[PDB]
Design an enzyme around this catalytic site. Structure first.
Site, PDB file in Angstrom:
ATOM      1  CG  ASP A  70      -2.178  -0.793   1.007  1.00 54.08           C
ATOM      2  OD1 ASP A  70      -2.845  -0.646  -0.045  1.00 54.08           O
ATOM      3  OD2 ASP A  70      -2.504  -1.574   1.922  1.00 54.08           O
ATOM      4  CD  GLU A 198     -10.081   3.854   1.953  1.00 54.51           C
ATOM      5  OE1 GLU A 198     -11.067   3.088   1.946  1.00 54.51           O
ATOM      6  OE2 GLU A 198      -8.919   3.470   1.683  1.00 54.51           O
ATOM      7  NE  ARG A 212     -12.062   0.399   4.562  1.00 52.79           N
ATOM      8  CZ  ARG A 212     -11.049  -0.124   3.870  1.00 52.79           C
ATOM      9  NH1 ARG A 212     -10.688   0.413   2.710  1.00 52.79           N
ATOM     10  NH2 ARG A 212     -10.412  -1.202   4.317  1.00 52.79           N
ATOM     11  NE  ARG A 289     -11.739  -4.438  -0.884  1.00 49.35           N
ATOM     12  CZ  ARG A 289     -10.729  -3.676  -0.485  1.00 49.35           C
ATOM     13  NH1 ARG A 289      -9.685  -3.488  -1.280  1.00 49.35           N
ATOM     14  NH2 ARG A 289     -10.768  -3.107   0.706  1.00 49.35           N
ATOM     15  CE1 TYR A 324     -10.552   0.487  -1.145  1.00 50.32           C
ATOM     16  CE2 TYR A 324      -9.540   2.644  -1.407  1.00 50.32           C
ATOM     17  CZ  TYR A 324      -9.712   1.479  -0.686  1.00 50.32           C
ATOM     18  OH  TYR A 324      -9.052   1.321   0.509  1.00 50.32           O
TER      19      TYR A 324
HETATM   20  C1  LNV Z   1      -4.194   0.366   5.316  1.00 48.52           C
HETATM   21  O1  LNV Z   1      -5.368   0.110   4.791  1.00 48.52           O
HETATM   22  C2  LNV Z   1      -6.240   1.131   4.576  1.00 48.52           C
HETATM   23  C3  LNV Z   1      -6.437   1.340   3.068  1.00 48.52           C
HETATM   24  O2  LNV Z   1      -6.925   0.134   2.539  1.00 48.52           O
HETATM   25  C4  LNV Z   1      -6.913  -0.168   1.205  1.00 48.52           C
HETATM   26  C5  LNV Z   1      -7.841  -1.219   0.723  1.00 48.52           C
HETATM   27  O3  LNV Z   1      -7.580  -1.756  -0.460  1.00 48.52           O
HETATM   28  O4  LNV Z   1      -8.607  -1.752   1.686  1.00 48.52           O
HETATM   29  C6  LNV Z   1      -6.112   0.659   0.261  1.00 48.52           C
HETATM   30  C7  LNV Z   1      -5.250   1.748   0.836  1.00 48.52           C
HETATM   31  N1  LNV Z   1      -4.067   2.064   0.110  1.00 48.52           N
HETATM   32  C8  LNV Z   1      -3.515   3.350  -0.028  1.00 48.52           C
HETATM   33  N2  LNV Z   1      -4.256   4.424   0.078  1.00 48.52           N
HETATM   34  N3  LNV Z   1      -2.332   3.405  -0.531  1.00 48.52           N
HETATM   35  C9  LNV Z   1      -5.141   1.843   2.339  1.00 48.52           C
HETATM   36  N4  LNV Z   1      -4.683   3.084   2.759  1.00 48.52           N
HETATM   37  C10 LNV Z   1      -3.319   3.325   3.038  1.00 48.52           C
HETATM   38  C11 LNV Z   1      -3.063   4.670   3.555  1.00 48.52           C
HETATM   39  O5  LNV Z   1      -2.545   2.519   3.050  1.00 48.52           O
HETATM   40  C12 LNV Z   1      -7.553   0.817   5.266  1.00 48.52           C
HETATM   41  O6  LNV Z   1      -8.393   1.804   5.022  1.00 48.52           O
HETATM   42  C13 LNV Z   1      -7.382   0.687   6.774  1.00 48.52           C
HETATM   43  O7  LNV Z   1      -6.804   1.728   7.388  1.00 48.52           O
END
Ligand code: LNV
Ligand SMILES: *[C@@H]1O[C@H](CO[C@@H]2O[C@@H](C)[C@@H](O)[C@@H](O)[C@@H]2O)[C@@H](O[C@@H]2O[C@H](CO)[C@@H](O)[C@H](O)[C@H]2NC(C)=O)[C@H](O)[C@H]1NC(C)=O
Ligand SMILES: *[C@@H]1O[C@H](CO[C@@H]2O[C@@H](C)[C@@H](O)[C@@H](O)[C@@H]2O)[C@@H](O[C@@H]2O[C@H](CO)[C@@H](O)[C@H](O)[C@H]2NC(C)=O)[C@H](O)[C@H]1NC(C)=O
Ligand SMILES: *[C@@H]1O[C@H](CO[C@@H]2O[C@@H](C)[C@@H](O)[C@@H](O)[C@@H]2O)[C@@H](O[C@@H]2O[C@H](CO)[C@@H](O)[C@H](O)[C@H]2NC(C)=O)[C@H](O)[C@H]1NC(C)=O
Ligand SMILES: *[C@@H]1O[C@H](CO[C@@H]2O[C@@H](C)[C@@H](O)[C@@H](O)[C@@H]2O)[C@@H](O[C@@H]2O[C@H](CO)[C@@H](O)[C@H](O)[C@H]2NC(C)=O)[C@H](O)[C@H]1NC(C)=O
Ligand SMILES: *[C@@H]1O[C@H](CO[C@@H]2O[C@@H](C)[C@@H](O)[C@@H](O)[C@@H]2O)[C@@H](O[C@@H]2O[C@H](CO)[C@@H](O)[C@H](O)[C@H]2NC(C)=O)[C@H](O)[C@H]1NC(C)=O
Ligand SMILES: *[C@@H]1O[C@H](CO[C@@H]2O[C@@H](C)[C@@H](O)[C@@H](O)[C@@H]2O)[C@@H](O[C@@H]2O[C@H](CO)[C@@H](O)[C@H](O)[C@H]2NC(C)=O)[C@H](O)[C@H]1NC(C)=O
Ligand SMILES: *[C@@H]1O[C@H](CO[C@@H]2O[C@@H](C)[C@@H](O)[C@@H](O)[C@@H]2O)[C@@H](O[C@@H]2O[C@H](CO)[C@@H](O)[C@H](O)[C@H]2NC(C)=O)[C@H](O)[C@H]1NC(C)=O
Ligand SMILES: *[C@@H]1O[C@H](CO[C@@H]2O[C@@H](C)[C@@H](O)[C@@H](O)[C@@H]2O)[C@@H](O[C@@H]2O[C@H](CO)[C@@H](O)[C@H](O)[C@H]2NC(C)=O)[C@H](O)[C@H]1NC(C)=O
Ligand code: LNV
Ligand code: LNV
Ligand code: LNV
Ligand code: CA
Ligand code: CA
Ligand code: CA
Ligand code: CA
Ligand code: CA
Lengths: 388, 388, 388, 388
Positions: A70, A198, A212, A289, A324
């Site tokens: 991520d 989000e 979320r 998903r 998403y």
């Molecule tokens: C860490 O996971 C978070 C986010 O989760 C996901 C997903 O595919 O579920 C994509 C994000 N990827 C990015 N935005 N790069 C994450 N958000 C981040 C900041 O890692 C989740 O919301 C829990 O905090």
């Protein structure tokens, strides 16, 4: 001269219609396409744009191996023409970011870009191409934001930000930013909302955000915000929930608290209040998903014994991967038109997507006050054709 | 109508924040990316841009073999969107050049481009796309310039140029150029500065340049210049030196002469005076071009027994390759914001970069009056993945 | 609002300086670059542009095999940023053409595009993107034109066109065209000029064209033209000739007729009258298209016993391939700056260029009233590295 | 400020001239080019553009296998510079569509995009980049439209749409759309026209459309339309028919009904009324989509015993593949210039095109009041050179 965007009402609508589709994975078969995830759409006076978090690698190259991860220093918010695949010849790099939001205030673009260590991240505020302000992580736990467009009213933009645990009590804030300068923030009241990430926001006079809850809520938290303060909070009343995972229909009517059933984790999603009714996007599967549909729930915005799914449009079949989804608006005459995008994730960790990378394509839909037809607009890639 | 850029003061700042990052080497794995070195950043009214000296070859092709070589007829100054990788589909060629400077005067772009034989080079002055003037080598020994943005005040641009030995007394000049026409030059006084190359300049009312002494100085020479003349010269007083190579901290407080310790050769770098203090960029290593940090030295601009490193931000770890760095400014309301870029060199002659080519990626940071977080933003390429 | 370009004098100059270089063959090693020949440069109010006749194939692909062929239906005039290599991501297609001219009148672009059968070709006139007029072949023998920029004065553009034999008496015409409409033509007087092709023109109050005599002249024919008529014709007096092939220096002073020595065939080239003197570009070889130099001949424009080569700049060594060359102008304050390009041909039929295709790169130079340095700016490709 | 496009007369013309040619298949040999079909051309105030229905795949990749298929969710209307090949670096995605029309009203672009299931399709109306209206399939049988430019007069655009059988009685409508809002529609009178698809329209005071009868007509149906209503309908009187398939010349003079000979299926084509005469494009073959010629038939627009083919220009030889063709107009001074494009289809199901994909290139011609020359401008690809 261009005026600041105004607090217009949402346009009337009764269904959603296919708009732009990029087919990015299909078109990336020959390694031209940039690896991305967490895409969204936002528009200025002249153009609607695709945004996404790139991974600093081309799809199917050795550097694309392991892009399920991520957060890396090699992620940037990029912008590219709406409905096109992101390639080196057409993209713009907005800022270094592994979490982001963007919005146009009528005059200039603002962006919010988080990067750095998980325990010491900062958000850079960009306005008209210049870095104008920043937010330092205060809970030291993955400072993060919307992954879709923020909203600006009369020159003041609002954006929701979270810092703290993914599956326990965290801090949630709204920031008000004007011409790139942070004016104030508020901690989101925790009287109703227990976890928030989000946010997908739009304007209907006031800013509405549907978010979320990654902890205890299979129903989605929401906020109503103006250019000065948070006005109202809650969870979407609809007994038909719209996070993933979630319970089978019908579940609990939970207007004021998380459902506490199938509560964690979640997926970014969106909705639109329409009078006392609500439109909610969701995966077709209650567990994964896959698929995408949008439902209209009669009286789904309010506390009522009369919730019924009056409409269901199935836009991506449950045999296809989704991801998403988020709202964006487009200015009409004297109202804002509600639109949304759906991220179509291919690669890890999707079952049978036998490649080493993780990326996405995009499809988008807009609301009109007409009856829609029907179809299916999935990613469309044959994963067996792709470089691994 | 656009006014000429004005002599504004530098904005207040207390730390630096990640801005744009191009990940160019990573994205060049499939041979799409142009080979470059000596990159920099400069902005006009509408956009900030990446500039670099291309090598007339694509990364990983046979023509990229041996691009460690500094000067060839196949090098051009190119421009590309900031934070994007340079590719054939997005670049513009500015001029033929193996040394360059660029700056925007508020109305048009000026460029200074050196090319030709080592013993008979000439610098072409380009203004608004037209070749308007030139400088002929007068010492017949690698006429060369900043490799970062020049500065323009009230329509008059200033640029520092050197002709003569790399490791002995040479000639150093400042040229004043207005709408592309050379107005005058001055030989830099040699009362203090003994060797000068590759000045990194910015505006803080007057133009300030912090440069590279390639001969006897591990401390950096500097000049203060206005639209008419050189006002002041010296070496940065800080007993914490910032060239590479350099002695271990602390070394000599040498305000008025080269340190005479670990004096040759050097690397292009930058700094920002802030009151009596100074911010200095430097490699983490004292011997090699690895790592990048920026330090703030209390009273480091002046002759004082009180120098202390009050802040150190480590932006590229010492386990990662760096390279050149330089200043650029971005206009805020009534001040200029200090920013910088770091060149991240991969390939020859870096130990264990087992490829035949030499190129770079870019990362950039801007100053804000806020406290920063922390992170690491290195090139990020796995050299073993690259075509050799 | 933009005024029509005016009849300005040529700027003073005493040497030529390296401007833009595209390194297109080098950069085409991975098959990204469009196959071209007969390039030129022309500028509008905002930008200078490269133009060339594409071959409807990418360099090193199977369709590039045999592109030595001059005329096919798959050739188009294309435009691309000056000094960039032509790629699918950056080019514009102007018109179908195997011979062309382009010029900007101050308001809009005009183009002249010949295509069709050798015995029934037509020239399409394009103005502001619209096809506005045409010329039908009247001698039915390869109707053809300049292969460099035409010139426009006070809204009326002039262009030289030929129809008839390559090595015997043919018809030569000048056409006057205003806002894309043919106003009139004149048959070029044959009192002096005996054969004329591929005129390279510029403005020095009047339009001056220096051309190619492919039949009996090793000296170049020339014309002086205004917005209404042909004013004067001749051959360049210089006893130092500048076509290829040509005799060794010195040859005949032939102001009024072809030399009749080493007369056929020729190469497109250019010159600039400067008072009674003349500057002439030429290959270094007297027999082949290798090398490029520009000479200044004292009193070389007039009938005089005093011709001497006062200056020789060698810009491409005789160990390197050259090709066509042509003039273009860039507006300065109250004069036009003389510039030129050199086509650097690689591939068939060049000895030891062991590939099946034929293409070129470009290098350009502009005149300034300063003394130049020296260097060498050849194509730079290692033909052994290229796909064949 | 830009006025709405006005109801100008067609310019005088006596022949057609080669304009732009993209050579897209030739240039797609290295898999850079997007797979397309059903291309067309339409112009705004500044530029003429190529449009086409993409297939969401690059030519010669595994995803291009089977692109003979007409309707998929992965098809989008794309736009690219006229005469360029469509590549990821130069295209724009307009909307999701497997049938489309586009036109510029003088201020903004309108597009009509059909997508979705065969039995439940909808057409999205896009105006100035925003989805403004829609049409839901009412016969539930492949709602479809022109595949070439619509026409706009005084701010009201007209477009022809069909829903129903390919080879039996269907519904045909004209829609009037103003600033993206549907104002009204009319069912096309069936007094004369019995089947109608794929109208090619232009403006000659009123809008004229010449279409495809896929059922019983080897002659083409036509309509004359203004900003308010359908004024006149018929079939082109010319006893020289212009659909494919069609009978040998001469066939029936059928002004008021389908010929009833060689009636099904057809190909999209075009024509231009000129006084009582008519110009008609057609394949050279009477049975297949090979070759392209345009004929002028004296008195061919009216009921007359005097029809004769007064002119035949052969533009693509019968040894070469053609395909769809359509009209577009370009504004001259006080008239519209008639132009057309020809789709040059390569791949399946063309005999001896031994590849798995189906795509096209484009060639275009414009009318002038001058006599043309002659030539041949086919696709030009050697199919044996292409990735399969
Ligand atoms: C860490 O996971 C978070 C986010 O989760 C996901 C997903 O595919 O579920 C994509 C994000 N990827 C990015 N935005 N790069 C994450 N958000 C981040 C900041 O890692 C989740 O919301 C829990 O905090
Ligand atoms: C916030 O915006 C208001 C104007 O918007 C109105 O009030 C918002 C809170 C919200 O209710 C919107 O939907 C409304 O349209 C600004 O109020 C104006 O302030 C100026 C200066 O005092 C005054 O002259 C106007 O009359 C005010 N307009 C109204 C209707 O009250 C307010 O300034 C904004 N606040 C900030 C912090 O920018
Ligand atoms: C995707 O990458 C994994 C991991 O690659 C290894 O570790 C990386 C960090 C890097 O250092 C690579 O050079 C390494 O090879 C690959 O999995 C490895 O595959 C190799 C070769 O078959 C094998 O020897 C190792 O055991 C594997 N390592 C692990 C952790 O499983 C994988 O093959 C890559 N996928 C593709 C499609 O290339
Ligand atoms: C150089 O610029 C000055 C204006 O800038 C001021 O003076 C500089 C030397 C420097 O100190 C800046 O920070 C200052 O802001 C020009 O001086 C002006 O000249 C015009 C014409 O004589 C006169 O009308 C103005 O009053 C002057 N302004 C001041 C404050 O003196 C000067 O012309 C510039 N010199 C050149 C060579 O262009
Ligand atoms: C990078 O290039 C070197 C040198 O290439 C040789 O000399 C060049 C100027 C050019 O003429 C090439 O064609 C030559 O091959 C390569 O080093 C050579 O490698 C070859 C083949 O293994 C060997 O025979 C020579 O001894 C080597 N020459 C030298 C001077 O060491 C090198 O292999 C290239 N690197 C890569 C990754 O391709
Ligand atoms: C051609 O241009 C002239 C103006 O340019 C001048 O004359 C040219 C022939 C050439 O000598 C240039 O260098 C000169 O600068 C036009 O003459 C003008 O015509 C208008 C209308 O009659 C008249 O009002 C002006 O006074 C004229 N100017 C002069 C100096 O005579 C002439 O109209 C142009 N011819 C065409 C066919 O467009
Ligand atoms: C460049 O092309 C020539 C000619 O190609 C042949 O004829 C063309 C029109 C086309 O039909 C091709 O498919 C043909 O192969 C090549 O020369 C031929 O090479 C082949 C294979 O070695 C040989 O059998 C023929 O005798 C050759 N024909 C001629 C006329 O010499 C040549 O190999 C190509 N060059 C490259 C680098 O690929
Ligand atoms: C349709 O356009 C007309 C103007 O165009 C004229 O009439 C068309 C039907 C066609 O015949 C064209 O070739 C003609 O040029 C509009 O008529 C105008 O309407 C306004 C408002 O009533 C009136 O002031 C003008 O005088 C009218 N012009 C004429 C010549 O009658 C008409 O409004 C348009 N209709 C729609 C639905 O937009
Ligand atoms: C074009 O594709 C066909 C069909 O591909 C098969 O079915 C597709 C839907 C997809 O699932 C592919 O993976 C399948 O291979 C190819 O025809 C097949 O070729 C394979 C391998 O030779 C053979 O085993 C099958 O019998 C063929 N199937 C059919 C229906 O004929 C064809 O080879 C492809 N063409 C090219 C040039 O690659
Ligand atoms: C020659 O070395 C000079 C420059 O050094 C370096 C560097 O990586 O140290 C890059 C340059 N590369 C280019 N700008 N191309 C050189 N400068 C030049 C002109 O060669 C040095 O400053 C001594 O004079
Ligand atoms: C035919 O040869 C003519 C032109 O010659 C050459 C050259 O390389 O010598 C390139 C051209 N190529 C193109 N412009 N495509 C030719 N000119 C044409 C029209 O073929 C010559 O000038 C005699 O008439
Ligand atoms: C179905 O066939 C129709 C269209 O036919 C053809 C053609 O190559 O003949 C291309 C189209 N392809 C697309 N526009 N994609 C079809 N039209 C559609 C809607 O399929 C025909 O006109 C009969 O109705
Ligand atoms: Ca490739
Ligand atoms: Ca949840
Ligand atoms: Ca040093
Ligand atoms: Ca000759
Ligand atoms: Ca038919």
């Amino acid at each position: 001269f261009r005026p600041f965007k105004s607090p217009l009402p949402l346009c009337p609508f009764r269904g959603f219609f296919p708009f732009h589709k990029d087919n990015a994975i299909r078109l990336g078969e020959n390694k031209d396409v940039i690896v991305t995830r967490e895409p969204y759409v936002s528009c200025d006076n002249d153009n609607c744009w695709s945004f996404a978090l790139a991974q600093g690698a081309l799809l199917g190259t050795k550097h694309s191996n392991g892009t399920i991860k991520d957060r890396t220093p090699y992620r940037s918010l990029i912008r590219f023409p709406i409905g096109t695949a992101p390639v080196l010849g057409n993209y713009k790099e907005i800022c270094i970011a592994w979490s982001s939001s963007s919005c146009f205030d009528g005059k200039e673009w603002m962006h919010v870009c988080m990067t750095g260590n998980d325990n010491d991240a900062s958000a850079q505020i960009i306005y008209g191409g210049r870095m104008t302000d920043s937010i330092k992580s205060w809970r030291k736990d993955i400072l993060r934001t919307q992954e879709s467009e923020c909203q600006c009213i009369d020159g003041t933009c609002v954006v929701a930000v979270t810092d703290g645990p993914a599956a326990n009590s965290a801090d949630y804030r709204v920031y008000w930013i004007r011409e790139g300068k942070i004016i104030k923030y508020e901690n989101v009241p925790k009287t109703k909302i227990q976890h928030l990430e989000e946010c997908s926001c739009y304007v209907d006079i006031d800013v509405y955000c549907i978010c979320r809850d990654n902890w205890k809520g299979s129903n989605r938290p929401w906020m109503r915000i103006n250019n000065e303060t948070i006005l109202e909070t809650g969870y979407v009343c609809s007994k038909f929930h719209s996070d993933t995972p979630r319970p089978a229909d019908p579940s609990t009517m939970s207007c004021d608290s998380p459902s506490n059933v199938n509560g964690g984790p979640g997926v970014k999603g969106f909705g639109f209040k329409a009078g006392d009714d609500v439109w909610l996007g969701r995966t077709v599967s209650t567990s994964g998903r896959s698929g995408f549909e949008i439902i209209k729930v009669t009286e789904g915005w309010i506390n009522s014994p009369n919730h019924v799914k009056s409409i269901t449009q199935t836009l991506v079949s449950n045999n296809d991967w989704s991801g998403y989804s988020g709202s964006f608006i487009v200015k009409a005459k004297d109202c804002f038109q509600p639109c949304f995008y759906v991220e179509l994730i291919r690669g890890r960790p999707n079952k049978n997507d036998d490649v080493s990378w993780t990326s996405n394509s995009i499809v988008t839909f807009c609301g009109l006050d007409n009856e829609p037809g029907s179809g299916n607009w999935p990613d469309g890639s044959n994963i067996g054709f792709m470089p691994k």
